[PDB]
Structures are given as structure tokens and as C-alpha cells.
Design a binder for this molecule. Structure first.
Ligand SMILES: [Cu+2]
Length: 228
């Protein structure tokens, strides 16, 4: 499926993100729109909290809110699981453990709906501290560069990823978010299962001065590396 998969991403692809979330019994929804340019490994997205203020810091949802837009160099094309699963797409599941705080469990469907790449997510957050960094909104509105370590999950016919996000805290400390990720294709067609490699992920967060709703503007650059 990789030949057709690659062809789906050679241009600029519209993106829709829909997240329904419940954190410590606080229900919220996020809607995101923008576009992806996999050739350049570039995402540009605008996210709105449609339900009110986000009950958690925007930066904590970045990983949850489309690794099919990663730039896989030609010499790594046989290691691109994400595109090879398209258009039928994949299920992306995570446990995100915040050190000394609560846990997110996420399930997402990532697939084409017509010419749009859609990320539809359910998130459940449990055991957050009422006056921790997360529910207290003491995380800086910024984002560090990270490596996403990818390994094949042959039994699942998919991939696993492990990485730790470092969230800057307003007091100059760091909040760690331990990410456990698994991806499973939805379709029956063949997918590429990769050799061990990583996604070099860079994220810039900004605000829209014209927007009254709680929101996040995101630019992301993602390149596959670690195979010579
Ligand atoms: Cu293929």
C-alpha cells in the first residue's frame, strides 16, 4: 500500500482534527484545521477549544492532536508505516503518564475522509492533582524538540513508539510526560513495518491575536532519521 500511500502526500493535504476529552470529570472538545506538506515534513494547524477554556494546558495535548506528515528521506521510504496505511488509515493509541501527576489514555482514528486527512480522538485523563502543573495551568506556552523512537510491533502488524515530552514549568522546573504509543492499520492491504528509527519533531506554538476562543496555533516540522 506504500506506493498509493506516498502518492496521497506528495502535495498539500487538508487536515481536520476532532478531540473529545474528559479530564478528572471535566469534559471538553477541541477542533483543529489546517494543512500538511509531508514532502517538507511540515504541519500548520489552528486548534479551538469549542466547549470553553481547555481544562489542561495546550502543550499537554500537542502529541495527541498525524505522523503520516513526517518527511521520510528517500533512503528511508521502506520504513514509513504511517503513509503505507493510507487511505484506510490507522488506530493510534497512547498512555501518557505525567510524572507525579495524572494519566491520559487516548484512542485516535487517522484516515482520509475524501481528500481530507482526519484525526478523530477520544481522550480520558484520570488522577490529576487539583493544584498540580496540569490542572493548575503552570506549564509555559512553548514546546521542546523531541525524538519519537519507533519500533515495529510485528504481532500487531504495526508500530510502537516510546518518548518522554519535557514540558517547561513557569517556576523553571520541567514536567515529564512519558508516552507509550501503539499504531494498528485499519485496512487489510499491506503496510511497511520499519527497522528501529526516530522522528525528529520540532513544534512552534503561537496565538491568533484576532481569536476570542481558547486556541493554539501550531507549526510542526518532522523528519525521519536514525537509518543510514
Ligand atoms: Cu505498499
Amino acid at each position: 500500500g506504500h506506493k498509493r500511500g506516498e502518492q496521497l502526500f506528495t502535495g498539500v493535504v487538508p487536515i481536520l482534527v476532532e478531540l473529545d476529552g474528559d479530564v478528572n470529570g471535566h469534559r471538553f472538545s477541541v477542533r483543529g484545521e489546517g494543512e500538511g506538506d509531508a514532502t517538507n515534513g511540515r504541519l500548520t494547524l489552528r486548534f479551538i477549544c469549542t466547549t470553553g477554556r481547555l481544562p489542561v494546558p495546550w502543550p499537554t495535548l500537542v502529541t495527541t492532536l498525524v505522523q503520516c506528515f513526517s518527511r521520510y528521506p528517500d533512503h528511508m521510504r521502506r520504513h514509513d508505516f504511517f503513509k503505507s496505511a493510507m487511505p484506510e488509515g490507522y488506530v493510534q493509541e497512547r498512555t501518557i503518564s505525567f510524572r507525579d501527576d495524572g494519566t491520559y489514555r487516548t484512542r485516535a482514528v487517522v484516515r482520509f475522509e475524501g481528500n481530507t486527512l482526519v484525526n478523530r480522538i477520544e481522550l480520558r485523563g484520570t488522577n490529576f492533582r487539583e493544584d498540580g502543573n496540569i490542572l493548575g495551568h503552570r506549564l509555559e506556552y512553548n514546546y521542546n524538540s523531541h525524538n519519537v523512537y519507533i519500533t515495529a510491533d510485528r504481532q500487531r502488524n504495526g508500530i510502537r513508539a516510546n518518548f518522554t515530552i519535557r514540558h517547561n514549568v513557569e517556576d523553571g522546573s520541567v514536567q515529564l510526560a512519558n508516552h507509550y504509543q501503539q499504531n494498528t492499520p485499519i485496512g487489510n492491504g499491506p503496510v511497511l513495518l520499519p527497522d528501529d528509527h526516530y522522528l525528529s519533531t520540532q513544534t512552534a506554538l503561537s496565538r491568533d491575536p484576532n481569536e476570542r476562543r481558547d486556541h493554539m496555533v501550531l507549526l510542526e516540522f518532522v523528519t525521519a532519521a536514525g537509518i543510514t
